[PDB]
Design a protein around this nucleic acid. Structure first.
Lengths: 95, 716, 735, 249
RNA sequence: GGCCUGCU
RNA sequence: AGUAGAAACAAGGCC
């Protein structure tokens, strides 16, 4: 038992910015309806999201960040952080 | 305080306590009261255990002195007084043999009557507290605990006291002796409370002495001490220093990219000089076969009898005479060696049973031919210094030689089909999976394609010759040995057949290093006249030994039949690698199977059968004066097999260097042909690196010529 | 028509048929004689790439040393070892900034390992230069000799059983006025301070054989035993650091290397938009080891170990301090021949300092003339740079720092670069909006490399568009392509023993099928050829044949005796049941149900006099030196049968003055066997403690006799006999 | 009896007595690895070169009293000349085959119980069912997978104590295993191998192999299961897939 | 002539 | 002579 707490998320307009943080490798995943869980970032990022999102960390106070720039209608979903065996609860992002 | 342990206690206990002191690594000069306390604990352990024996009954027999007998069993057997590893060894052994429970801490004694442990501890404080203290330290313990204290009192759970009371009177007399002897000493200002359980240490790795001065001489130029340099490093922070030096650095330090275009690459220059000679250990294109049509298998049979029987199958022997001399040796020696071989072959034919291996006489002829007693005798430098001729071994670049057209034709005919099957493969587990059936069908196709190939015949020849030579060298190190070149094939009709190319005489082979050379002399029959390509036979001596009549529509030819005789040499590494020539088959057919799989990944179906039967698709596998010629997949198989065989035959450092430095340029050219805007930083350097590998090896020069032709045909 | 295989590349791309360009079916090049010429050439080349440095003379060793650090900046593209301290410190600082907490963590785990490491870890190494005899010997032998000499001289801290204590004793030995060594011809010889310093700072040079891919031979070096502990700790730190860097590829295997290369190329190209162009450079570094100054490694480690306990910093700094003053033994020597008098002679290399130059050719004459000033006591000072990749991991760290220094946050320009570095080789993917941007990026990368003492080989490097490149004989063309020509040399009999060779061959076929995309039919052909060679090598033919050998008679009688002949092993002249489906099963277990119980029992009999097992490490581990790579170990599945014998040893020690080593070997092995019979766990877990042999053995005899009576065969008569025999050996050890 | 007797015989001679006295337990490993024999650089070359000699292998001295010096025709089986740095004697390879045709026989029924991994592999393959081969491009992606299919969820050190307590119960020392999974494993492998006389070292090695989890990075396409990775060479190829179901499932 | 070694 | 190629083999040492 180590546990993860997402912060960030909210409603945001198309083309605008958000900062996610995950307090506690490290990754971010997202899930909508219709489809499934989708890999976002681990630095490594799935192709659909490159240049738009920056995953970063700060070891010093146990936090991983996702900077999300140039957001789109398709970027609406629950964002989860994970770690290696563990997940957080989530925060919904609505573009 | 240590004077007390100097005075009273016996040596045995004091050195036992000193080793226990060394055990946990603390020093005795800082706190000694622990030493005295635990040595008294150890003393009570002894005095409580000793003088107590048992016999086959219980009811321990107590004797002040053990009498000479088998009855020396000890009532209580000690735990402490040993290292932790052995203390736990005894604990585990007792638990596994007595079926008792394993304690988590160290006991002090074991007893049989009650079949259990004793943890003796005599503390300064009164018993009725220390007892339950150590009891709550030990979890759910059945080992009985018993403790004394200086006032003279005893206690125990179960009201149990395990042996005689006079022994306990002994214990407490010892105890008060200790007490009112410190009375004369006067230690209780700390004796009651002197240990509090201190465990701490700091690791110290100090640079000092000479090793420090060395540290002062391993710094940047403008530093004086390791202290100052470490302080500077700790105080250093990035303030844009790479940018300053990059700006200040001269601009001539650059990595400008030179575009690589179709007109950029130039043909590789080949060395010029005398034509290239033959280096193989046996004839490849000019071999001749004497046969018997026997039913024996490859390894089955005896060599000498088979060779003699094959040679008796030929009629037309003539007295041998010189045709083409060695040009550097003594050809009469070769002639006499050939006649000697014939004579001794007859000598074997006469006697009762053909020997499995024959040794030859060491005549002057083969003494010269095999290079015997020619190594300079090894001496000491102090005895040979004034000799003017004394110098290093000749160490220079090999002689330069230009390519000749014979290697090209030899490779051409090394890829041609034959009228025999030169591979008889072993057995495999019966195929059970469909993929195994596909693999077996593919393998059968490739075997049908490559078995009738001169490359396979060369593979078998080399493998057999090198195996026999290595075995003879390892067995008959001293004495010259005869080995007939034998290879067994199978005709189209299916009848098995043997073939005798000639003979090999192995010489002294006291091979210590992997590079040490064993010299032999090889004799091989042939029909190719050496008067047409003399430069290819620089190191051979060729005689005329007979005439052969092969059925032809032009009456019958009645061709001459010559003997190529030469002195050659090999080494343990060369023999070992030449006896693994069968992996050329692997290399080649792995390449072809990779081609087939890659093409079949496109069309979702196995594509082997149509490739091998329809023969619609073809690959560029050679160039004719008309242009580039393409052949079916089988011809590609044979060509790659021949390439691998020649790589294994003409192996040399030149080949490796050229292969690497030409694979680089091949990759660059492929990038150019793929429209990937290739670029180079120094192409002239790469060209010079490639051209320095081409010196005198026919195979590498032929590869370079092939590369030039490929460049000419490519880049269009 | 003339056949030409190379023309095949006109239809098949180069990488799809690159296996044809690997002549790995013939004997690889070998060196024949001394490696002294190569050693001298390497020393001179290393010293002349840093000629513009500053000269000094060490006050301890008295040897001339050349320091090029912070020297004049290069003005040409030739190799240069003039690394700048500030630039490298800044590069390490940026590496830390991009990966916060890397150095502190790595130092923490390294500190744990150093303070819990044992001395025996030094025995797990190949040949090392023993200075007690001035020659290369197995790591364990050299360690034992050095420990014996130290104990004879009074340095007995290593008795604590800790590697840190052994290093403490090693350093304390540096400050001794006179040590003593043993020589056999036994004679006790005295070594003064300077002589022992040079003997502890020296390296042994040899010639590398079985090196495929170059026309010329090279020289390699082996250090002593005093400096190997510091090297072990430094490499542990460097490995812990590199494991946290994704741009490094040295501490991983081949498949991981390919995966990381694919990931980096996809990351670089995919993130690049239509406007940005991408180019891959397949770079090799010329004279990689000769241009890496140990002082710079000292700087890197002291920056890494900032804000750490001073003892940790000292112990990690000792190694580069000794490398900066390292000496190299010239080599075996030189052999001369006189044809007029028909004789040969062998002069040791130590005479090169004083021997006249009339015997040497022009090239060797000039090499000796140039290297003589650096000769001190038969060895040449090699301060300027490393000899042969001893600090592989630190070099990889420096290269990774260079790679990361272009993350587009430090470039401050549109162009940027990334890639993968493995010492002496790298792939660099550089993206920029235009060809001018790519040119500027590559130029700046090259310039920054030249500021760190790292040179890029322009002759062995080329740049193309991303999608096609090479890295350590791995050819990437829109996806890695199998070669199978690098593993060809490993398809024969390994040479361990019969069962081991069979298992290793089948396992190698299996692995090359899994990794190197070996085809099914090709794998079957490989199995057939391997079985043929195996039978022809071990004289174990099918048994139903008439191939007369030295072993064909017993095999044939075993064949005729057996009823179910399908269960006989190929080693005993039985049929081969292996196939593509059975490549992962040991031979014994595949034929278990077919063997006759008599033959099965005779084969797998524990009491067989052939099977010998020494330690848990050497049970089923075989050391196969792969072609074009460093020595590697493989786990092979095998059942302990009567065929698991170990082969004969060299036996040439009997003609050398070092003949007493065999008697010591025999006595040590007898004592070790006795201890193992006393302590069965001696092999599986190496015993620890500070007591001596006889104490443990006698005391355990006491206890085991006791308890084995309390239930077992012993009797009172025997138990008392053992007790008094223990007393007898006690009083014997007393006197 | 015997053991202490050769101990006393060793201590009788001065050199071995000194070796036993001055050498501490920690140095055990060092002196045990103390040898003049270099590790071979080219094993294949010399194995192909040594096997052409007479008496190319080595065996314990006891072979001189179980196998006759010569066979029926007089081919020598063993020699009395000892190895370089050991008391073992050099013997011919025939002495191996001889041992397999007239040597002492035993009951090998327990080898299947010892070599659990290999026999489990054989049993799994014997009951496997193959399927059609499908030819299509396989996207082999590289992944970290566990190769050992019988790992009991234990690490090397974690199972090393279990192995000692199973084989060497007395040298365990302080450790007494807490996890109950280890308790049941110890009980089972103790009662199963209670009298097996193969060797303590090989038993420990095979227990380590069976129980300890091991992982390696491999190019896979599908599968990913432990049982499906041991046959990864047979089920997945460059352009073909062979459906397979081991006997376990 | 007799005997020793073949990675030391 | 031959093998081979930046240095070697074409037996070594011990009596």
């Amino acid at each position: 038992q180590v546990q993860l707490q997402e912060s960030g998320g909210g409603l945001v307009q198309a083309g605008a910015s958000l900062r996610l943080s995950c307090t506690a490798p490290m990754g971010w995943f997202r899930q909508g309806p219709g489809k499934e869980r989708e890999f976002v970032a681990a630095t490594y990022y799935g192709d659909f999201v490159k240049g738009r999102f920056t995953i970063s960390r700060d070891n010093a106070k146990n936090t991983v960040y996702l900077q999300m720039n140039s957001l789109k209608p398709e970027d609406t979903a629950v964002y989860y952080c994970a770690r290696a065996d563990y997940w957080g609860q989530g925060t919904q992002v609505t573009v | 305080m240590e004077d007390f342990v100097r005075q009273c206690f016996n040596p045995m206990i004091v050195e036992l306590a000193e080793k226990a002191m060394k055990e946990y690594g603390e020093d005795l000069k800082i706190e000694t009261n622990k030493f005295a306390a635990i040595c008294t604990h150890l003393e009570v352990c002894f005095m409580y255990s000793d003088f107590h024996f048992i016999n086959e009954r219980g009811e321990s027999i107590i004797v002040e002195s053990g009498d000479p007998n088998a009855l020396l069993k000890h009532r209580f057997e000690i735990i402490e007084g040993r290292d932790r590893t052995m203390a736990w060894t005894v604990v585990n052994s007792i638990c596994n043999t007595t079926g008792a429970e394993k304690p988590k801490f160290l006991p002090d004694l074991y007893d049989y009557k009650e079949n259990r442990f004793i943890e003796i501890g005599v503390t300064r404080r009164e018993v009725h507290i220390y007892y339950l203290e150590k009891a709550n330290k030990i979890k759910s313990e059945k080992t009985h605990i018993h403790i004394f204290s200086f006032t003279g009192e005893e206690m125990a759970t179960k009201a149990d006291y395990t042996l005689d009371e006079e022994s306990r009177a002994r214990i407490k007399t010892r105890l008060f002796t200790i007490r009112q002897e410190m009375a004369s000493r006067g230690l209780w200002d700390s004796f009651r409370q002197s240990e509090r359980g201190e465990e701490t240490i700091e690791e110290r790795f100090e640079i000092t002495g000479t090793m420090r001065r060395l540290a002062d001489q391993s710094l940047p130029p403008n530093f004086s001490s390791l202290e100052n340099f470490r302080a500077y490093v700790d105080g250093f922070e990035p303030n844009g220093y790479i940018e300053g030096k990059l700006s200040q650095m001269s601009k001539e330090v650059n990595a400008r990219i030179e575009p690589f275009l179709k007109t950029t690459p130039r043909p590789l220059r080949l060395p010029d000089g005398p034509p290239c000679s033959q280096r193989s250990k046996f004839l490849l294109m000019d071999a001749l076969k004497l046969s018997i049509e026997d039913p024996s298998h490859e390894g089955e049979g005896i060599p000498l009898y088979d060779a003699i029987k094959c040679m008796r199958t030929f009629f037309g022997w003539k007295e041998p005479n010189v045709v083409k001399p060695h040009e550097k040796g003594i050809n009469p020696n070769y002639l006499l060696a050939w006649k000697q071989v014939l004579a001794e072959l007859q000598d074997i034919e006469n006697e009762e049973k053909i020997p499995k291996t024959k040794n030859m006489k060491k005549t002057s002829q083969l003494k010269w031919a095999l290079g015997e007693n020619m190594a300079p005798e090894k001496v000491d430098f102090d005895d040979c210094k004034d000799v003017s001729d004394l110098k290093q071994y000749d160490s220079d670049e090999p002689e330069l030689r230009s390519l000749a057209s014979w290697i090209q034709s030899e490779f051409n005919k090394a890829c041609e089909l034959t009228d025999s099957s030169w591979i008889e493969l072993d057995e495999i587990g019966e195929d059970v999976a469909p993929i195994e059936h596909i693999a077996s069908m593919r393998r059968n196709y490739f075997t049908a394609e490559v078995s009738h190939c001169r490359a396979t015949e060369y593979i078998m020849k080399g493998v057999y010759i090198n195996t026999a030579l290595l075995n003879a060298s390892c067995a008959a190190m001293d004495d010259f040995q005869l080995i007939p070149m034998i290879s067994k094939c199978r005709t189209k009709e299916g009848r098995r057949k043997t073939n005798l190319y000639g003979f090999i005489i192995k010489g002294r082979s006291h091979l210590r290093n992997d590079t040490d050379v064993v010299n032999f002399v090889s004799m091989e029959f042939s029909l190719t006249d050496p008067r047409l390509e003399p430069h290819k036979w620089e190191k051979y001596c060729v005689l005329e030994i007979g005439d052969m009549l092969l059925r032809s529509a032009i009456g019958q030819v009645s061709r001459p039949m010559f003997l190529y005789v030469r002195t050659n040499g090999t080494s343990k590494i060369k023999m070992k690698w030449g006896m693994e020539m069968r992996r050329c088959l692997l290399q080649s057919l792995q390449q072809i199977e990779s081609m087939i799989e890659a093409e079949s990944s496109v069309k979702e179906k196995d594509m082997t059968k149509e490739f091998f039967e329809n023969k619609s698709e073809t690959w560029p596998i050679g160039e004719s004066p008309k242009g580039v010629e393409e052949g079916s997949i089988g011809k590609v198989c044979r060509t790659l097999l021949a390439k691998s065989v020649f790589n294994s035959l003409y192996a040399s450092p030149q080949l490796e260097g050229f292969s690497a430095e030409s694979r680089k340029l091949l990759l660059i050219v492929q990038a150019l042909r793929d429209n990937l805007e290739p670029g180079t930083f120094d192409l002239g350097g790469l060209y010079e690196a490639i051209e320095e590998c081409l010196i005198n090896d026919p195979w590498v020069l032929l590869n370079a010529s092939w590369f030039n032709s490929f460049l000419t045909h490519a880049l269009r | 028509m003339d056949v030409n295989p190379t023309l095949l590349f006109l239809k098949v791309p180069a990488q799809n048929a690159i296996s044809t360009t690997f002549p790995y079916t013939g004997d690889p090049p070998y060196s024949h004689g001394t490696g002294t010429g190569y050693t001298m050439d390497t020393v001179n080349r290393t010293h002349q790439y840093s000629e513009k440095g500053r000269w000094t003379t060490n006050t301890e060793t008295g040897a001339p040393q050349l320091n090029p650090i912070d020297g004049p900046l290069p003005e040409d593209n030739e190799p240069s070892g003039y690394a700048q301290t500030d630039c490298v410190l800044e590069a390490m600082a940026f590496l830390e900034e991009s990966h916060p907490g890397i150095f502190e963590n790595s130092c923490l785990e390294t500190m744990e390992v150093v303070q819990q490491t044992r001395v025996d870890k030094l025995t797990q190494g190949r040949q090392t230069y023993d200075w007690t005899l001035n020659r290369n010997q197995p790591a364990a032998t050299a360690l034992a000799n050095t420990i014996e000499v130290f104990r004879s001289n009074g340095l007995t801290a290593n008795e604590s059983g800790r590697l840190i204590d052994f290093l403490k004793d090693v350093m304390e030995s540096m400050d001794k006025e006179e040590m003593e060594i043993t020589t056999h011809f036994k004679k006790k010889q005295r070594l003064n301070k300077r002589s022992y310093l040079i003997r502890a700072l020296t390296l042994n040079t040899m010639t590398k054989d079985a090196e495929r891919g170059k026309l010329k031979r090279r020289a390699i070096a082996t250090p002593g035993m005093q400096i190997r502990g510091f090297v072990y700790f430094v490499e542990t730190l460097a490995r812990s650091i590199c494991e946290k860097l994704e741009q490094s590829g040295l501490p991983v295997g081949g498949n991981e290397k390919k995966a990381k290369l694919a990931n980096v190329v996809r990351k670089m190209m995919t993130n690049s938009q239509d406007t940005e162009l991408s180019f891959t450079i397949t770079g090799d570094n010329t004279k990689w080891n000769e241009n890496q100054n140990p002082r710079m490694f000292l700087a890197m480690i002291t920056y890494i170990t900032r804000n750490q306990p001073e003892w940790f910093r000292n112990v990690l700094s000792i190694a580069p301090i000794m490398f900066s003053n390292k000496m190299a033994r010239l080599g075996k020597g030189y052999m001369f021949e006189s044809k007029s008098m028909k004789l040969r002679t062998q002069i040791p290399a130590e005479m090169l300092a004083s021997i006249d130059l009339k015997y040497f050719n022009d090239s060797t004459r000039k090499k000796i003339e140039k290297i003589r000033p650096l000769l001190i006591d038969g060895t040449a000072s090699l301060s300027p740079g490393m000899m042969m990749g001893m600090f592989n991991m630190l070099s990889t760290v420096l290269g990774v720092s260079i790679l990361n220094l272009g993350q587009k946050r430090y470039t401050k320009t549109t162009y940027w670069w990334d890639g993968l570095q493995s010492s002496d080789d790298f792939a660099l993917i550089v993206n920029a909006p235009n060809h001018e941007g790519i040119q500027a990026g590559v130029d700046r990368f090259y310039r920054t490399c030249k500021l760190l003492g790292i040179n890029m080989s322009k002759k062995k490097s080329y740049i193309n568009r991303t999608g096609t490149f090479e890295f350590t004989s791995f050819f990437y063309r829109y996806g890695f392509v199998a070669n199978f020509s690098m593993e060809l040399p490993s398809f024969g009999v390994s040479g361990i023993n019969e069962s081991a060779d069979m298992s290793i061959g089948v396992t190698v076929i299996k692995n090359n099928m899994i990794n190197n995309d070996l085809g099914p039919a090709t794998a079957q052909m490989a199995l057939q050829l391997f079985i043929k060679d195996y039978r022809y090598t071990y004289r174990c033919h099918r048994g139903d044949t008439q191939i007369q050998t030295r072993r064909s008679f017993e095999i044939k009688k075993l064949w005729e005796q057996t009823r179910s002949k399908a269960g006989l092993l190929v080693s005993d002249g039985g049929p081969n049941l292996y196939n593509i489906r059975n490549l992962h099963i040991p031979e014994v277990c595949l034929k278990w149900e077919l063997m006759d119980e008599d033959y099965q029992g005779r084969l797998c009999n524990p009491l067989n006099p052939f099977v010998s097992h020494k330690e848990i490490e050497s049970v089923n581990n075989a050391v196969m030196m792969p072609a074009h790579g460093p020595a590697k170990n493989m786990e092979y599945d095998a059942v302990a049968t009567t065929h698991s014998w170990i082969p004969k040893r060299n036996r040439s020690i009997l003609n050398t003055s070092q003949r007493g080593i065999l008697e010591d070997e025999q006595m040590y092995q007898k004592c070790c066997n006795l201890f193992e019979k006393f302590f069965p766990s001696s092999s599986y877990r190496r015993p620890v403690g500070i007591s001596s042999m006889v104490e443990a053995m006698v005391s355990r005899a006491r206890i085991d006799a006791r308890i084995d009576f309390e239930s077992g065969r012993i009797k009172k008569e025997e138990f008392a006999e053992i007790m008094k025999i223990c007393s007898t050996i006690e009083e014997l050890r007393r006197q | 009896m015997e053991r202490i007797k050769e101990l006393r015989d060793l201590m009788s001679q001065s050199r071995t007595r000194e070796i036993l006295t001055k050498t501490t337990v920690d140095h055990m490993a060092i002196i045990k690895k103390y040898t003049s024999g270099r590790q071979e650089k080219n094993p294949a070359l010399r194995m192909k070169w040594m096997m052409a000699m007479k008496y190319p292998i080595t065996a314990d001295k006891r072979i001189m009293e179980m196998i006759p010096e010569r066979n029926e025709q007089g081919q020598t089986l063993w020699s009395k000349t000892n190895d370089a740095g050991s008391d073992r004697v050099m013997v011919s390879p025939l002495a191996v085959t001889w041992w397999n045709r007239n040597g002492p026989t035993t009951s090998a029924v327990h080898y299947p119980k010892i070599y659990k991994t290999y026999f489990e592999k054989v049993e799994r393959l014997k009951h496997g069912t193959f399927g059609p081969v499908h030819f299509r491009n396989q996207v082999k992606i590289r992944r970290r997978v566990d190769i050992n299919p019988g790992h009991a969820d234990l690490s090397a050190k974690e199972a090393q104590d279990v192995i000692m307590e199973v084989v060497f119960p007395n040298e365990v020392g302080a450790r007494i295993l807490t996890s109950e999974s280890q308790l049941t494993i110890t009980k089972e492998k103790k009662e199963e191998l209670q009298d097996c006389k193969i060797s303590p070292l090989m038993v420990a090695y095979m227990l380590e192999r069976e129980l300890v989890r091991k992982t390696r990075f491999l190019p896979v396409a599908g599968g990913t299961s432990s049982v499906y990775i041991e046959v990864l060479h047979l089920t997945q190829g460059t352009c073909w897939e062979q459906m397979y179901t081991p006997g376990g499932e």
